[PDB]
């Protein structure tokens, strides 16, 4: 089987930047009849895959002159001359010369933007969920930038790694930062075994985690 | 003008059948190959299988034996008969007409999505998120609301019914067991909360859900 590696899986760009893609084959790709079957595809967010190139450097008619394929043996790259908003996407690559057919895991084109250090919010489980005999320990890291960040949680001073459901937002259209969810879901009983419940936020600006908590019996 | 438009995707049991159907127009099944991609959750596209012009079938090993594709030339009808589904076979199907040893995918339909799943309509649990007393010695402050356990997806939440929008940042929702659960944030200043009324409405059209939570301080 051969196996199309996609890097990086996230490209973030200005526009009016001239960017490469690459996406490699774990063996060559060579159909029998000779031909290099190497397509590459834009999902634009909300939409179908529509091809850009085909057999490595074919530029699907009723696309634009600025994107392009190029690439040899297992190496291949899709080219964009001058990116614009529209581009804004995930890409994939994709080898039909062997069976079976494979795709390539994508790579997210995105905006570049200043950092930000992501706002931390913790918040107790509701009354409601207590009365119902439940305890969801929420946090939000909202509007941060770059999208790398890493959630810890620790409970009464130690760290609590099983049971935690965390959720990110796509780049925001407006500010183009990033924003992410963890839940850490308990039970009534369990979250009353503990006093102390902590959110930390590592984020290549802050380094020293951000520390958000409470306590159940104060604040 | 080459229209593809799947249908039959729904929810199914695993181990379950489903047969989906994509309705071609603009062109002819002898003169192109038809292929069965699908997105899945993490959004990572799979070959299901093709047929070309003149008959031929292929399937990866993962479909092999379990799907079934085949094809209606005379009323251009494309279809995917599946079988033996599991939770990994949830994802959004599209009929594909690409050129005969020339592109594989050159163009696809919209999708149909098909759901593999054990779970019941389930209607969902909405809290209220309330700041702790530390959050809320800023000018701005962060309210929450928590949709949990629901089934299927997906739910509609707004914040005063839509009047709130700015500000907001409603996460995707995810599977806490065969159930799905979901969070919206909502960032305003300190003057304008609690000083005025802030409610998290949620809606569930499957279980005819439409809750009203409001976002009180806590505190005794
Ligand atoms: C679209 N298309 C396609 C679609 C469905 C089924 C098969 C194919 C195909 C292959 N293999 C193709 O053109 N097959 C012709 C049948 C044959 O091998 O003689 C092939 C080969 C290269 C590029 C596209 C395609």
């Known amino acids: 089987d051969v196996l199309m590696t996609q890097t990086p899986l996230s490209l973030p760009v200005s526009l009016g930047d001239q960017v490469s893609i690459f996406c490699t084959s774990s063996?060559?790709?060579?159909?029998?009849?000779?031909?290099?079957?190497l397509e590459w595809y834009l999902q634009k967010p909300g939409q179908s895959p529509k091809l850009l190139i085909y057999?490595?450097?074919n530029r699907f008619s009723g696309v634009p002159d600025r994107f392009s394929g190029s690439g040899s043996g297992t190496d291949f790259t899709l080219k964009i001359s001058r990116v614009e908003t529209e581009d804004l996407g995930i890409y994939y690559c994709?080898?039909?010369?062997?069976?079976?057919?494979?795709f390539g895991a994508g790579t997210k084109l995105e905006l570049k933007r200043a950092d930000a250090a992501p706002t931390v919010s913790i918040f107790p489980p509701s009354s409601e969920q207590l009365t119902s005999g439940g305890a969801s320990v929420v946090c939000f890291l909202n509007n941060f930038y770059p999208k790398d960040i890493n959630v810890k949680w620790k409970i009464d001073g130690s760290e609590r790694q099983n049971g935690v459901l965390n959720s990110w937002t796509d780049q925001d259209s407006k500010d183009s930062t990033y924003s992410m969810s963890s839940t850490l879901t308990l039970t009534k009983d369990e979250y009353e075994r503990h006093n102390s419940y902590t959110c930390e936020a590592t984020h290549k600006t802050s380094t020293s985690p951000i520390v958000k908590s409470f306590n159940r019996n104060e604040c | 003008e080459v229209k593809l438009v799947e249908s039959g995707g729904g929810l199914v049991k695993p181990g379950g059948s489903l047969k989906l159907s994509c309705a071609a127009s603009?062109?002819?099944?002898?003169?192109?190959?038809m292929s069965w991609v699908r997105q899945t959750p993490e959004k990572r596209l799979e070959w299901v299988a093709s047929?070309?012009?003149?008959?031929?079938?292929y399937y990866p090993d993962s479909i092999k034996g379990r799907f079934t594709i085949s094809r209606d030339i005379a009323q251009n009808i494309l279809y995917l008969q599946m079988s033996s589904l599991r939770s990994e076979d949830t994802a959004m199907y599209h009929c594909?007409?690409?050129?005969?040893?020339?592109?594989?995918?050159?163009?696809w339909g919209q999708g149909t999505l098909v759901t593999v799943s054990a779970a019941k309509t389930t209607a969902p649990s909405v809290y209220p998120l309330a700041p702790v007393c530390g959050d809320t010695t800023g000018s701005s402050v962060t309210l929450g609301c928590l949709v949990k356990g629901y089934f299927p997806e997906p739910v509609t939440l707004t914040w005063n019914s839509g009047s709130l929008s700015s500000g907001v940042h409603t996460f995707p929702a995810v599977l806490q067991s065969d159930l799905y659960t979901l969070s919206s944030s909502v960032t305003v200043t300190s003057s304008t909360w609690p000083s005025q009324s802030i409610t998290c409405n949620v809606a569930h059209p499957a279980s005819s859900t439409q809750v009203d939570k409001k976002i009180e301080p806590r505190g005794p």
């Open positions: 594909i007409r690409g050129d005969s040893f020339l592109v594989w995918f050159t163009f």
């Open positions: 603009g062109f002819s099944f002898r003169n192109y190959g």
């Open positions: 047929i070309s012009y003149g008959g031929l079938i």
């Open positions: 063996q060559t790709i060579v159909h029998t009849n000779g031909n290099t079957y």
């Open positions: 057999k490595v450097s």
């Open positions: 994709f080898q039909g010369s062997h069976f079976p057919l494979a």
